[PDB]
């Protein structure tokens, strides 16, 4: 079982993600080089849905020159029936890697954080706010994290979604979503790389989980650790108030990423 994209042929090794009317496959070209092909079935896409895919593609295609911490997009084919995107495959997504992992070499954790910062700082320079960041949005390639998608088209699962990394102001927006919203979620991803759990992962009830995320007087456990800088990045990312929340440009000058 194989497929053609802009003439080149690729044989499916296996499937690695899905969601809505799309699939991601690990495939090989004729030289047995490996890629990930995303397949979108356009059969039932509404004009809004369609336009969100076109847009996501335009920007991904564009932003590749601007950072190497953004997934490679080699080619794509778009008809009225389907889309194929030929991308870089990498090794695995960050959500999978975390679950198959007890603890993380702190040097590797700070390396991963730098990459995440860089990729999101890039999409923000072009006016894009992801607003739904999770570990699944990042790919591990040669020891580097790369951002896989921009939040514009609908989300993929590697293989129910998740509510842990969701920022406060998204929930009170019920305007209002800014770049600081991404800092909350990057915050929850680092929190989890540090303290082996997302901030509210214990509290399995869902209504209550959203309650705790907005609740100013619910407070967050910051178990004391050697890296006091790391400690301070987490506290600054996780300010429930966004005007008080650290920015990405600030985060990039924080001692946690800059010192020693
Ligand atoms: C993460 C998800 C939604 C599946 N999408 C992707 N994944 C990729 N690489 C990958 C490899 C291996 C595993 C794995 N867990 O074995 C996962 C993921 C590469 C990609 N270019 C995309 C996309 N689009």
Swiss-Prot record:
Present in rapidly proliferating cell lines. Residues 10-257 form the Protein kinase domain. ATP binds at residues 16-24, 38. The active site is at residue 132. Interacts with TPR; the interactions occurs in a microtubule-independent manner. Interacts with MAD1L1 and MAD2L1. Belongs to the protein kinase superfamily. Ser/Thr protein kinase family. Involved in mitotic spindle assembly checkpoint signaling, a process that delays anaphase until chromosomes are bioriented on the spindle, and in the repair of incorrect mitotic kinetochore-spindle microtubule attachments. Phosphorylates MAD1L1 to promote the mitotic spindle assembly checkpoint. Phosphorylates CDCA8/Borealin leading to enhanced AURKB activity at the kinetochore. Phosphorylates SKA3 at 'Ser-34' leading to dissociation of the SKA complex from microtubules and destabilization of microtubule-kinetochore attachments. Phosphorylates KNL1, KNTC1 and autophosphorylates. This is Dual specificity protein kinase TTK. The gene is TTK. The chain holds residues 519 to 794 of 857 of the full protein.
